[PDB]
Design a protein around this ligand. Structure first.
Ligand SMILES: O=c1[nH]cnc2c([C@@H]3N[C@H](CO)[C@@H](O)[C@H]3O)c[nH]c12
Ligand SMILES: O=c1[nH]cnc2c([C@@H]3N[C@H](CO)[C@@H](O)[C@H]3O)c[nH]c12
Ligand SMILES: O=c1[nH]cnc2c([C@@H]3N[C@H](CO)[C@@H](O)[C@H]3O)c[nH]c12
Lengths: 278, 278, 278
């Protein structure tokens, strides 16, 4: 009853938004990139660009966080057509997990087959340094709300297997690219937590104990939903501050944005080659 | 005000459903069994059976998960009258914890004094094998919603003690039965998590670090509420897949159901003797 | 839209309640004390006292937990004017985190610059004994709802830094006072969890693994919001029961209250001197 009508209404919104976007587009991208905090300038590398602001898209959330421009960018990255979310949505803004991940449902209907996720994070692995790029090999969902709770959208499984949520072959390829380009990359586990407070030292320590290498407030829900949708996932987390015991200092979102912006060109090189060698 | 009217409305629903069921019943069971995924065929061992479908019961949730038949079964298991929930409800379906546990509140009013809980789970203890029966000696509530939040139903404590949530004497008796019958049993801690995604390898590892031996998406809320109600609890978790580091493979709910169905006869032997020797 | 109107309505309630309280007050306290379970008799040490019951304050929650009297007390502790919350609010009662922490938002508008938080807790550090006072040096937020989710109240940061949530200088001063008075104090990490069940042995063990020294069902949300408000925090947790592996026994809220009441005079000595030497 109520759970069903909720799902029906969501399917209607997905179709209305997807129809709206097809009516605006003149390319057929098969890869999408979600650009997190400070990482929006990847879009300066997109050619033949055109843009649709989130505020103009029916049913779309809007980005309220500083450093999230709030537009969809279409164009070529290297020689392949892509679409990029220049800015994303977070559960701490007040959005439900179904609103946070609504764009991934719409990307499925637009023909996206691969999703690249990026974010700024705090490093809990003591080997990490600010500015490191961490290829995400697995994640921990530490949010209190799961985007798939409720009636199942029937094109994916009621109970998705998550043994390989991040495509192993894309990671192997990204490693090869990074080695050829001489770009240092880390690898590890991202934990997603609601925020919006940065962690206490005890909370950073907790996340280290649980096996996380980097912590942030995004990404996990979009990966879950991409997995449900059958969309392949690659993810890079940019370490923008340290949550390492003995090394914690005051952090600010302003400094996070500057650190992410400084690392963006190396991240974009890897993603551009990953798209273009496939 | 609002929390109170909510409780009042819940008490009204409990009484209306309990009155409905008393009006259909012609036995007085003092033990109830909740049958989880793949475990419904315990009901083929019940004699003098009669059934009430969940869809016909006022205020009852319905089971939407494959492998949950959705009926209450009354009859004798061995020589004692029981009632069995052939199928249960889960928080990942969209039900609130007060809906998930509503049947335990109704069982209190029907005179149930002991609750047996069963489920299918993923094993995180590296000694476990698919098909093992794990007697639940304690649990970890890892769900984001607690069934007792809000105004307290005054026949139980505001703050239940949970030092012995699973009756120690029923575990001792079940161990003795299993030894006499030559049925191998494990013992350990069940962790309940919302789902509906199966765990990533990092999440299985997290649950091992926290001290869990098996993980699933049910059972904990019903045990909490049974404890509040003064109903004694015994629980068996059937290990249907491994979440052990180095041994993880793709899992599916279809294979979970087949593994649980294969273990059901040994589980039922223990429960039948436990009921009949008391 | 909805998140904004929600915030606007909350700002209106904060101002209406703060105006109401200013209209009743005839002192200008700069320190407030939140008194948890069993700790209300600190208010017997306040001189020139006057009281406002929570039920008479517009928009205030009321305390439904035994041992929480439900009034605001104004007067002098030593020679400084203070205000004390004699009783607090908890998420397990059904209150949202914005209701639980509404008094801290109102205290900001009343001119409070320092908040002392007190609570009764279960000890997970094996060195602790019932009746110990634990100065809180850091905390772990294990609640499923964060008081800052949603639109940010613009006088504090979207993303508060939490590297020093508990003022280090107040802890140093409290340690010095305790040493001069010969009062034994512990120091450690408080973890806040929703409740209302006391923890299972497995849950107490989990909290020990995560690095907690004491566990309770309060305090963290108020500290988060005080931090957002720019109000300095000091906190003492009174260990009222043990959640130490091998030493767990049945606990009751009645016994918790008696244990907290027995420790209150030593807690009050430290807080009174901390207020009066500043
Ligand atoms: O140390 C951290 N802890 C949690 N999140 C973040 C972030 C992420 N960037 C934002 C805050 O800078 C926010 O959206 C979060 O997801 C950077 N560093 C950290
Ligand atoms: O490995 C697991 N992780 C989490 N839950 C389950 C289950 C339980 N059975 C269902 C999915 O097969 C679901 O209701 C869950 O509670 C079996 N194996 C696992
Ligand atoms: O062992 C414990 N676990 C969790 N909370 C508490 C408490 C706190 N006091 C109340 C229950 O006695 C409740 O509000 C909780 O915050 C004392 N001991 C414990």
């Amino acid at each position: 009853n109520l759970y069903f009508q909720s799902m029906m209404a969501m399917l209607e919104k997905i179709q209305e938004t997807a129809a709206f976007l097809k009516g605006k587009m003149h390319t057929s991208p098969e890869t999408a990139i979600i650009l997190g905090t400070g990482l929006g300038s990847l879009a300066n590398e997109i050619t033949e660009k055109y843009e649709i602001k989130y505020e103009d898209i029916p049913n779309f959330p809007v980005s309220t966080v500083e450093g999230h421009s709030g537009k969809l960018i279409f164009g070529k990255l290297g020689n392949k057509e892509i679409m990029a979310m220049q800015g994303r949505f977070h559960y701490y803004e007040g959005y439900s997990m179904k609103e946070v991940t609504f764009p991934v449902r719409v990307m499925r209907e637009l023909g996206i087959k691969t999703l690249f996720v990026s974010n700024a994070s705090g490093g809990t692995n003591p080997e990490f340094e600010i500015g490191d790029l961490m290829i995400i090999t697995d994640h921990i969902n530490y949010f209190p709300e799961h985007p798939l709770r409720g009636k199942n959208i029937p094109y994916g499984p009621r109970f998705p297997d998550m043994s390989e949520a991040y495509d192993k072959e894309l990671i192997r390829k990204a490693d090869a690219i990074a080695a050829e380009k001489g770009i240092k990359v880390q690898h590890g586990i991202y934990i997603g937590t609601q925020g919006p407070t940065f962690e206490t030292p005890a909370e950073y320590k907790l996340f280290h104990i649980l096996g996380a290498d980097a912590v942030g407030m995004s990404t996990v829900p979009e990966v879950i939903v991409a997995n449900h949708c059958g969309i392949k996932v690659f993810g890079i987390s940019v370490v923008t501050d340290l949550g390492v015991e003995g090394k914690i200092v005051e952090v600010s979102h302003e400094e996070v944005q500057k650190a992410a912006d400084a690392a963006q060109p190396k991240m974009t090189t890897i993603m551009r080659e990953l798209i273009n060698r496939a």
